[PDB]
Design a protein around this ligand. Structure first.
Ligand code: GTP
Ligand code: SPV
Ligand code: MN
Ligand code: MN
Ligand code: MN
Length: 620
């Protein structure tokens, strides 16, 4: 009801009808419309016609440019201050800090950023009132996971950015059919604004609306709400991806008995006609998408991609660990992608793809560092900074975190079960990161508990996907450090508890290192498609082949167990060397980290594995 005409926003709806929305969805839209004061409300239907009009609008506004060389591909250039996920402005709100992070012994927590409800209310009120003035509020109904899948969850994202709408159409399942499936069910509430109400007080760089000073990405798991302000970019604005499908979801998974993880899912078929699925957790910028889409060098082997970034997993009644990819597309790092490093991505991205912050060629194409493809005479390059660019300039032509956004169904090796609602059965889990020294090419964990310790102990040299820079070795347990939705100690206990489940078929756990360097700073391992030789060894180990040798850190391939035919120049002694001096220091760093950062919430089984590793190294 109303005493005037200030609460009913029906007169501002330019697509759809508030009356057709489920009651709780309507309240969420209208209540936030009252707060944010949009000029128009657009309820997305997911149709091709809608997508075409939004592209045309963004093109008319100068937000995107058409890449005339390809089929329906587009380029967006951002403000250089809004180029990546920002870990330091990402917070989780719970009544008690211990629900979100373990209370550290001495230092500041690196495992999350907690904010009190009272502090968030002040931050919220300083940002959102009136923030969409003069803009359209888009209502995005989306499903994470195939519609109707038992592990599928529905969200509603409100946003004032058409770029977010177009990207969410690719990255999620979006539109009218989701609203019909939702009915009066529960949904995750996602609220986003670029934070630039009109009239603009500050001019825009590259026609990219953002508010870097006020950027804040908040999660309220108890209210099932995600609230993001000030950034239009990737993990900050596509709220289904990191905010929902890892942070909120990992908390729900803890409550409901499943897992939500930063893992690719791949299926690999051997020359005997046997197929197995594996999941792999590597940190951002550490090669998940390259592995998920790999073109194997070994003849008679095939790799198919289920997903490249997020996995939701649950034991079924039979004890199989089943996984789904909740995403609908790939949001992949562009630089370094070439016919030699990821040819299956090259095939995927040549139609229906949105590129952000890569270079444009004068004939309507895309360019980036590492594309490894020469240009014809006379073709010139415009950098992501909208400037003429020559290879003689110092700066790269594409931002290091520039991305492609592409439909998963276009991938030529997309797995036939990638949308199956029952998920695929996982028989191995791979961990790994960038370790230039000390850590061998591959090893296998000694037990479930040791494998959980291996995940907990993950470290990786700093890349350029967050705001971290330089060559520092940082901790990134389970590749989830930016993404834990709750107390990491309780997350470890959750993982350990899977061994207590009746008839659970626990997968084998492996750790890889593609990145070991020699004294010259040269990679010892060619990687990319050649990583199929490591997968072959894992496949045989899952089948029970006697192809491993025991070391203090776990099982490693026997001499001649790895197919190295075609790379006779491979230094196997350096690739698999285990130095007592390196590992004595490694265990001390892991010990100091777990003691400070996990403290009273460290499960005893993890401390026991640490003690056992220390003892095995001491006996070397
Ligand atoms: N040496 C070596 N480098 C690799 C290999 N696979 C991938 N890379 C490197 O990994 C980098 C690209 O990784 P990203 O696409 O950023 O990694 P990602 O895990 O998919 O990142 P997110 O999408 O942010 O989660 C490039 O620097 C590649 O050179 C490999 O097998 N060997
Ligand atoms: O940082 C990551 O792991 C990504 O996959 C990119 S974003 O979705 O977080 O922007
Ligand atoms: Mn205009
Ligand atoms: Mn990726
Ligand atoms: Mn990722």
């Amino acid at each position: 009801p109303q005493l005037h005409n200030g609460l009913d926003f029906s007169a501002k709806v330019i697509q759809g009808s508030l009356d057709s929305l489920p009651q709780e969805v309507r309240k969420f839209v209208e209540g936030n419309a009252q707060l944010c004061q949009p000029e128009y409300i657009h309820i997305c239907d997911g149709s091709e016609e809608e997508y075409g009009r939004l592209l045309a609008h963004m093109q008319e506004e100068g937000v995107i440019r058409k890449l005339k060389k390809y089929d329906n591909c587009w380029l967006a250039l951002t403000d250089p201050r809004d180029v990546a996920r920002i870990e330091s402005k990402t917070v989780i709100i719970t009544q008690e800090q211990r629900d979100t992070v373990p209370i550290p012994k001495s230092g500041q927590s690196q495992l999350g950023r907690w904010m009190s409800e009272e502090d968030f209310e002040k931050a919220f009120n300083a940002r959102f009132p009136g923030c969409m003035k003069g803009r359209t509020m888009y209502v995005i109904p989306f499903s994470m996971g195939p519609l109707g899948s038992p592990l599928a969850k529905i969200g509603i994202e409100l946003t004032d950015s058409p770029y977010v709408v177009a990207s969410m159409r690719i990255m999620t399942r979006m539109g009218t059919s989701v609203l019909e499936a939702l009915g009066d069910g529960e949904f995750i509430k996602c609220l986003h604004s670029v934070g630039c109400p009109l009239p603009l007080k500050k001019p825009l760089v590259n026609n990219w609306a953002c508010n870097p000073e006020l950027t804040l990405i908040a999660h309220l798991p108890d209210r099932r709400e995600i609230i993001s302000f000030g950034s239009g970019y990737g993990g900050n604005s596509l709220l289904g991806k990191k905010c929902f499908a890892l942070r909120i979801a990992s908390r729900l998974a803890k409550e409901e008995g499943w897992l939500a993880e930063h893992m690719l899912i791949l299926g690999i078929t051997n020359p005997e006609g046997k197929k197995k699925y594996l999941a792999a957790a590597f940190p951002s910028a550490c090669g998940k998408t390259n592995l998920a889409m790999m073109n194997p060098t070994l003849p008679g082997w095939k790799v198919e991609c289920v997903g490249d970034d997020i996995a939701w997993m649950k034991f079924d009644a039979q004890g199989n660990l089943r996984a789904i990819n909740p995403e609908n597309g790939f949001f992949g790092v562009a630089p370094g992608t070439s016919v030699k490093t990821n040819p299956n991505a090259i095939k995927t991205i040549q139609k229906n793809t949105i590129f952000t912050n890569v270079a444009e060629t004068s004939d309507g194409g895309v360019y980036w560092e590492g594309i490894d493809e020469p240009l014809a005479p006379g073709v010139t390059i415009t950098s992501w900074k909208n400037k003429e660019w020559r290879p003689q300039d110092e700066e790269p032509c594409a931002h290091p975190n520039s991305r492609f956004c592409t439909p998963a169904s276009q991938c030529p090796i997309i797995d036939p079960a990638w949308e199956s609602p029952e998920g695929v059965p996982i028989e191995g889990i791979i961990f790994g990161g960038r370790r230039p020294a000390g850590v061998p090419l591959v090893y296998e964990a000694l037990s479930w508990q040791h494998g959980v310790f291996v995940g907990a102990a993950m470290r990786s040299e700093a890349t350029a996907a967050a705001e971290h820079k330089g060559k520092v070795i940082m901790h990134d347990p389970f590749a989830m450090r930016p993404f834990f939705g709750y107390n990491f100690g309780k997350y470890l206990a959750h993982w350990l508890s899977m061994a207590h489940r009746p008839a659970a078929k626990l997968p084998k756990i492996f750790h890889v290192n593609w990145f070991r360097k020699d004294k010259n700073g040269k990679f010892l391992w060619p990687g990319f498609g050649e990583n199929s030789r490591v997968l072959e060894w894992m496949f045989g180990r899952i089948e029970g082949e006697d192809s491993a040798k025991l070391t203090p850190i776990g099982y490693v391939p026997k001499e001649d167990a790895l197919n190295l035919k075609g790379l006779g120049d491979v230094n196997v002694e350096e690739l698999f060397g285990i130095s007592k001096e390196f590992w004595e220091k490694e265990v001390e760093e892991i010990d100091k980290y777990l003691e400070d950062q996990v403290n009273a919430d460290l499960p005893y089984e993890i401390e026991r594995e640490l003690r056992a590793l220390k003892q095995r190294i001491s006996q070397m």
